[PDB]
Every structure is written in C-alpha cells, then in structure tokens.
Design an enzyme around this catalytic site. Structure first.
Site, PDB file in Angstrom:
ATOM      1  N   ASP B 142      -1.227   8.523   2.662  1.00 21.52           N
ATOM      2  CA  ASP B 142      -1.519   7.169   3.150  1.00 21.52           C
ATOM      3  C   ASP B 142      -2.935   7.042   3.729  1.00 21.52           C
ATOM      4  O   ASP B 142      -3.143   6.373   4.746  1.00 21.52           O
ATOM      5  CB  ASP B 142      -0.475   6.737   4.191  1.00 21.52           C
ATOM      6  CG  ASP B 142      -0.519   5.238   4.489  1.00 21.52           C
ATOM      7  OD1 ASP B 142      -0.901   4.447   3.598  1.00 21.52           O
ATOM      8  OD2 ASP B 142      -0.171   4.848   5.623  1.00 21.52           O
ATOM      9  N   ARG B 146      -7.855   1.604   7.060  1.00 20.15           N
ATOM     10  CA  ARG B 146      -7.009   1.176   8.179  1.00 20.15           C
ATOM     11  C   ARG B 146      -6.399   2.349   8.957  1.00 20.15           C
ATOM     12  O   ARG B 146      -6.060   2.196  10.128  1.00 20.15           O
ATOM     13  CB  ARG B 146      -5.895   0.229   7.692  1.00 20.15           C
ATOM     14  CG  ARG B 146      -4.594   0.913   7.293  1.00 20.15           C
ATOM     15  CD  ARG B 146      -3.628  -0.045   6.612  1.00 20.15           C
ATOM     16  NE  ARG B 146      -3.706   0.063   5.155  1.00 20.15           N
ATOM     17  CZ  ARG B 146      -3.077   0.979   4.419  1.00 20.15           C
ATOM     18  NH1 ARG B 146      -2.296   1.897   4.985  1.00 20.15           N
ATOM     19  NH2 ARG B 146      -3.228   0.979   3.099  1.00 20.15           N
ATOM     20  N   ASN B 147      -6.246   3.501   8.304  1.00 17.82           N
ATOM     21  CA  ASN B 147      -5.675   4.694   8.942  1.00 17.82           C
ATOM     22  C   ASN B 147      -6.728   5.722   9.363  1.00 17.82           C
ATOM     23  O   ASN B 147      -6.419   6.900   9.548  1.00 17.82           O
ATOM     24  CB  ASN B 147      -4.639   5.347   8.020  1.00 17.82           C
ATOM     25  CG  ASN B 147      -3.454   4.442   7.741  1.00 17.82           C
ATOM     26  OD1 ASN B 147      -2.979   3.726   8.624  1.00 17.82           O
ATOM     27  ND2 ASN B 147      -2.970   4.470   6.508  1.00 17.82           N
ATOM     28  N   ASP B 160      -2.190   8.247  11.474  1.00 14.86           N
ATOM     29  CA  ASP B 160      -1.043   7.773  10.748  1.00 14.86           C
ATOM     30  C   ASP B 160      -0.307   8.687   9.811  1.00 14.86           C
ATOM     31  O   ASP B 160      -0.171   8.407   8.649  1.00 14.86           O
ATOM     32  CB  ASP B 160      -1.409   6.515  10.019  1.00 14.86           C
ATOM     33  CG  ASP B 160      -0.574   5.357  10.413  1.00 14.86           C
ATOM     34  OD1 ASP B 160       0.523   5.198   9.862  1.00 14.86           O
ATOM     35  OD2 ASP B 160      -1.035   4.586  11.247  1.00 14.86           O
TER      36      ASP B 160
END
Ligand SMILES: OC[C@@H](Nc1ncnc2oc(-c3ccccc3)c(-c3ccccc3)c12)c1ccccc1
Ligand SMILES: OC[C@@H](Nc1ncnc2oc(-c3ccccc3)c(-c3ccccc3)c12)c1ccccc1
Lengths: 303, 303
Positions: B142, B146-147, B160
């Site tokens: 992932d 954003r992470n 994350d």
C-alpha cells in the site's frame, strides 16, 4: 537669496496608469494600488495612487498640492518621492508602491519574526531619511511609525509630507497656528508654543523608535491627549520597552529632553544606531533571534 | 528455522499520554495528536494516537494488532515505528507525531515552494525505507504519497502497515484473497493474480513518485478502477510530468514493466535518485527554483 527649487513636477495622463485595487481610505480620500505604463517605454511601474474624497474642498485641494510640492522636492533612498500628479476631477498624487505597507502595521503583524538586526537597521534608515530632510531644510512635523512605509523588510522610506514645512536660510523654527497635530508624537515646545524645528522631529523620532521597539504599541495607551502636556512637564516619559537595553533606551530618552539642543542630531543617531547594528544582540534582547522538556520520539530510545 | 522476531511490544498506560486535538477521521477510526509523558522521565514526546471507531468489530480489532505487529517490528530512519499500544476499550496505536502530515497533501499545498532538491531527496528517502523493508522481508502492499508522512520538510517516513505482510525465507510472493486494494497503485500481476512481491512495491513506488512530480495529481484522474486493468495490458502508463526530464521519467517507466524482475530494485533506485540529487536542476525543471516588463520606480529614473 535662497536656493531656487528646480524640482520637476511631472504631469501624468490617466490613460498611462491603471488602478488595480483600493489599499485604504481614511479622512484623506482613498489610496489605490496600480501600474504605471509610460507609453513610449517598455516598462510597468508599480505605483500608489492617492486622491482626496470625490468632492472638492478649496482648502483640501491646496493641501494635496503642498504635499506634491514637498514630495517632488525630495530625492533620497530613505524618503518617499513623487513620481507625478494627474490633473483629473480631483488631483491625484502618484508615487512608488511600498507593497508591505506602513511599518506600524508591519511590526504588529510580524512581532514573532522581527529580529534585532531589522529593528536597529530601520532606526538607521529613518535617521538617514530625517537627516536628509534636515539638509534639505525640511521639518516633517508628523514622523511616526505609521508614516514610514516598507518597500521590502530590509528597506524603509519616510512618507506623508502633508504637514511638512520648508525653513528659510535665516530661519531656525516654524510657528504653527491651526493645530490638530498628533499630540503624543510631538515635542513639549510644539504643544506649549506651536514651535517646530529639526529637533522637534527628533522627539518624534524618539517616539517612532519606541513604537518599533514595543512592536507597535500605542504611546500613552490609556491617557487622553488633554493630559499629555501635563505629564511631560512633570518629567514622565514613555517606559523602557522589554527588549531594550539601557544603551538603546538612553538614546530614546535623549530625544525627549526639554532643551531641544540637548537632544541628539539625526547625524548622531545614524552613527549610534549604526554602531549597534554591527552587534545587534548586545543592544536588543529578543527571545527568538508550551514546554522545554519536549523530546522527539526518535531521540527517546526505548528503556 | 526462521529468524525469531524479538521486537518488544510496549504497553502504555492511558494516564501517561494526553490527547490534544483530532487530526483526522476516515473509515479507520480517528487519529489524535497528543503528548506522551512517561512518569519516570522528564520527557514529553509528541505522539499520534490511532484508535478504531468506538465500537468493536472482531475482524477490525485483529487488523489493528496486525498493524501493531509490523510497526513494532521495524526500525529505520525512513520508516514509521510503533512506540506502543494502550489496551483501553478499543486498542490504541501510539507513534511519533509527523507534524506536517502526509506527503500527498504537503506537495499539493506547497506546489509553489517545493524545489527539485526536496522532490529528489524524498525519492531517495522513500527508496531507502522500502529497501529496509525488503531486507526485513516485508512487502508493504500500500505504498502511495498518502502513506508517506513528513516529520520535517527534509525528512519523510513510510507508514500505514495495515496491509503489510511478512515473507518467509523460502518464499518470494504473497497471495491475497479478500482484495479491496487501491487499484491505481498496484502492479498488473497484483490486479490479474493477487500476487504481491517486493517488485510489486516498486510499481507502487513508481506511482508514488509520479504523484510527487505532478505535485499531488490523482493517477488516471478520469478513469474508473474497472478499466485500469485493461489500459495497463494495452501498454498505457501514467504520462510524463511537465517538470520531469526523460532521465527521471525513464526511472518511473522502468518501475512499470510487465516483467517484475525487469523493474529496478530499491537499492538501485536509491543510487540513481541519489546521483540526481547531487545536481537536481539537471533532472527536474521547475520555474521557481503577471508581467516581466515590470521595473521598480527607483530603477526608472525620470527622462
Ligand atoms: O500615506 C500616503 C501614501 N501611501 C502609500 N504610498 C506608497 N505606498 C503605499 O502602500 C500603501 C499600502 C500598501 C499595502 C497595504 C497598505 C498600505 C500605502 C498606503 C495606503 C493607504 C494608507 C496609507 C498608506 C501607500 C501615498 C502618498 C502619496 C501618494 C500616494 C500614496
Ligand atoms: O496513517 C496512520 C498514522 N497517522 C499518523 N501517524 C503519525 N503522524 C501523523 O500525523 C498525521 C497528521 C498530522 C497533521 C495533519 C494531518 C495528519 C497523521 C495522520 C492523521 C490522520 C490520517 C492520516 C495521518 C499521522 C498512524 C499510524 C499508527 C498510529 C498512529 C497514527
């Protein structure tokens, strides 16, 4: 008999410049932000455009022209100069845009990021501008933090020559009559006798410095202008600002001597503040330049 | 048989830390900003405190603990690490506060002030973090802008780990089943066969870089996730960002090869982006790093 003033008063066409936005609007009409584009050249000059309230007061129209006369007659890096006027319905004054506005508002909304280097450098620059006006035989009569504008954070200029007056070769002081001058910035002799001199400007310079050092405090905050005359006679003066070493505060106090000639000259103020600007933290103590046990997680290694 | 995981899972008391403010609240519960004050020490550690929605889903409670297991098992300057958990009504994850938030939002609301040095340095740091996870035998599954969180503008960390998985010594890929993984960041083999490997992370790293280089654009903006599989099979890829030299864009394209082994390794990505970080303007063209005939009034001397 006296040095003939050969300043050039440039007359600008309204079609040459363009109002972008209103900057402010007190009891002096409105000041616009705009661009001036002389037709011949390939230049676009950012300008401030001042005009009185749409109507026409006989006395008010004259006073804008007096302000034009004095601004047109000055040329110094630390003084605001007139670019020209435009003769529309009401006369328009045009000058270089000082985008960061007046220094009073600047010190207020940047308290946390103004270091001693900037404060002391501003004091030097204002002293140079005032010294230039003294050479030009000009008494400002309205020096304050609000009447010093900011071209960049490191470059300020004196402005607002609406109350300024030219002294003759054989003349050492100006005698006012109408009054209505900001009481809290003026010297005692000016309040008591409406006398204005270069040393009266030094008093005002003292108060201007106090404003800067207190990051835009209002002088005699709780006191009405009626009492001001009395408290000065008794020997009461503006207090020592927290960040001010006795060295700096002594300069401010010297500007507020009863004897005008005992006050320092602007040339001396340039020297003293210049010396201090070389080692600014020796003369102004600012914490910058809610916990102190805080440690980042990757400096706190697991026990 | 396999290297025993001797990571320490620290259990924190709720009285030791204090929630100051909510930072965000999606479908993963809420993340709080707070201070952690171990009773014995004289320290105050800024922390992010994550807990699931007040209720208790059997499956959701397990997954927070999986995220705790992986975060507790990692230790690298470019990877987010668990400080501990607090066993309240719902389990709380505690980690170092990354005050500047996720890098996706950062690039968006600082487009105008992000230079090529920062962009390329972030690429190096994310590559180092991902390389560390590869050594630790961990597939993230992932990775996205954003992470990646921002401790300071010049220091970022990967976070994350809710979808992360540990690969065995005799194991080269992970086989998913549930799905519901962000389609636009995953490699073709992961969409087509639910296969995840370190080289699947490299694809995602490619897309993460594209996000940064486009200052936070959404990949395949107008395309629904249903079509994504098809367009990749045909050979369509994310376009070349305006600021990207062919040199940089070639690295991104290499991350998106069909053959996973043809893609570059994170160790190679560290080297290549590092080289480029030494002369960043040769590899990214940013105008910074509405008129150009504008001249200041005190450079336009009166004709
Ligand atoms: O004080 C009168 C003086 N005014 C300014 N002059 C140059 N540059 C400025 O910039 C701002 C300004 C800019 C940004 C924010 C706020 C102010 C103001 C200015 C505008 C209104 C009142 C006072 C000063 C301002 C003036 C004198 C003669 C002709 C035109 C304008
Ligand atoms: O993504 C989960 C991760 N979150 C953060 N972790 C550290 N520092 C952060 O800082 C912000 C943050 C800070 C300022 C503004 C915005 C966000 C967030 C964070 C908060 C909400 C959602 C995503 C990240 C955040 C996390 C994981 C485990 C335990 C706690 C928290």
């Amino acid at each position: 008999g006296e040095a003939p003033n050969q300043a050039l008063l440039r007359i600008l066409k309204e079609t040459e410049f363009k109002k972008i936005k209103v900057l402010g609007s007190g009891a002096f009409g409105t000041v616009y932000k705009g661009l001036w584009i002389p037709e011949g050249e390939k230049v676009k000059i950012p300008v401030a455009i001042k005009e009185l309230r749409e109507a026409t007061s006989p006395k008010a129209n004259k006073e804008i022209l007096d302000e034009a006369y004095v601004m047109a007659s000055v040329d110094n890096p630390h003084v605001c100069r007139l670019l020209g006027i435009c003769l529309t319905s009401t006369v328009q004054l045009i000058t270089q845009l000082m985008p960061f506005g007046c220094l009073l508002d600047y010190v207020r909304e940047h308290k946390d990021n103004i270091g001693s280097q900037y404060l002391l450098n501003w004091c030097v620059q204002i002293a140079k501008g005032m010294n230039y006006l003294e050479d030009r035989r000009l008494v400002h009569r309205d020096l304050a933090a609000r009447n010093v504008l900011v071209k960049t954070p490191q470059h300020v200029k004196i402005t607002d020559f609406g109350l300024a007056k030219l002294l003759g070769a054989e003349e050492k002081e100006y005698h006012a009559e109408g009054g209505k001058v900001p009481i809290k910035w003026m010297a005692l002799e000016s309040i008591l006798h409406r006398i204005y001199t270069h040393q009266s400007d030094v008093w005002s310079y003292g108060v201007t410095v106090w404003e800067l050092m207190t990051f835009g405090s209002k002088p005699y905050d709780g006191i009405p202008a009626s009492e001001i005359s009395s408290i000065l006679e008794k020997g009461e003066r503006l207090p020592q600002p927290p960040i001010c070493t006795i060295d700096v505060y002594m300069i401010m106090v010297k500007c507020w001597m009863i004897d005008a000639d005992s006050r320092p000259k602007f040339r001396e103020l340039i020297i003293e503040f210049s010396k201090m600007a070389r080692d600014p933290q020796r003369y102004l103590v600012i914490q910058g330049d809610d916990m102190d046990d805080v440690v980042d997680a990757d400096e706190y290694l697991i026990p």
